């Protein structure tokens, strides 16, 4: 690799993500959005499901 | 998976696409699932000469 090549000849670092979906015991997921708590009003809640 | 390829072969990492980066180096299936990421890096992988 040289710093003067045409774009098609300079290097490219590359990374590919591949993962199974056989629905095996879940190992990865990341929302977990948490809202501030409200008290003394009848409110719709979702506590860990 | 991580590796470095030329800048005209980046396209070769795709399901069942022919070329010279997915013919004898490494090839992924045609029913592949996931994502791919590439970025031209010419300031750390390209020297003068």
């Amino acid at each position, epitope marked *: 690799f*040289r*710093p*003067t090549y045409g774009v098609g000849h300079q290097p490219y670092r590359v990374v590919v993500l591949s993962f199974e979906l056989l629905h095996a015991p879940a190992t990865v997921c990341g929302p977990k959005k948490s809202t501030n708590l409200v008290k003394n009003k009848c409110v719709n809640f979702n506590f860990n499901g | 998976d991580s590796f470095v390829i030329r800048g005209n072969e980046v396209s070769q990492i795709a399901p069942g696409q022919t070329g010279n980066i997915a013919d004898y180096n490494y090839k992924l299936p045609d029913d592949f699932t996931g994502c791919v990421i590439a970025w031209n890096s010419n*300031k*750390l992988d390209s*020297k*003068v*000469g």
Partner: antibody
Amino acid sequence: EVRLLESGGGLVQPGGSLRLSCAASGFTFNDYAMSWVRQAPGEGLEWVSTISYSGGSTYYADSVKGRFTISRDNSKNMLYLQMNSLRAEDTALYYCANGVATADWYFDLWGRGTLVTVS
Amino acid sequence: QSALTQPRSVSGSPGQSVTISCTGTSSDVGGYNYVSWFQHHPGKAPKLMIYDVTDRPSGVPDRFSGSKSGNTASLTISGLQAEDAADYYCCSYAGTYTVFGGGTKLTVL
């Protein structure tokens, strides 16, 4: 990223004294040997001097021994060449180089060079 | 020479701003984005203030800034201090060579 910068050229009189400097950037200066290579008008490239990554090892070319002194300050990422008894055959463009991407003893990274003129 | 064209001299008053221009050819400034700016006092090594047209290396205040348009690069120094007085060189890495401008001596009166 990785850059080499030569410095310290100017007009000096024959038998005079000069200090060259080389400024490293984008890599671990103290992990790598540094060398000075010059190119005098009409002549090919000439290796002048090499200093190891530490500073405890200095190598010089026969054509300039005694009169040339290579040095490095690993705290400041700077390389130096002290040229004394400067002669006319020392007029040249001066380069510092190292082997960050190949090996310690090679010159793969280069500066553009600084011009030293001996009247 | 073939160096990038810089002013030979620029003057500014301390605390004020000064802009320095650097015009080259289609093989250097207008070829790649590998343009550097250097502070220099003859007899000592330049200190890298700008590499990567607009990015500052370590230890250089944001008073020094860089820009590019076409084959012309521009350095701007804000908040001039007496110690900013020096020679300033633009610089371009072009693959097969690096090339400096002829330099601008900045005097802070």
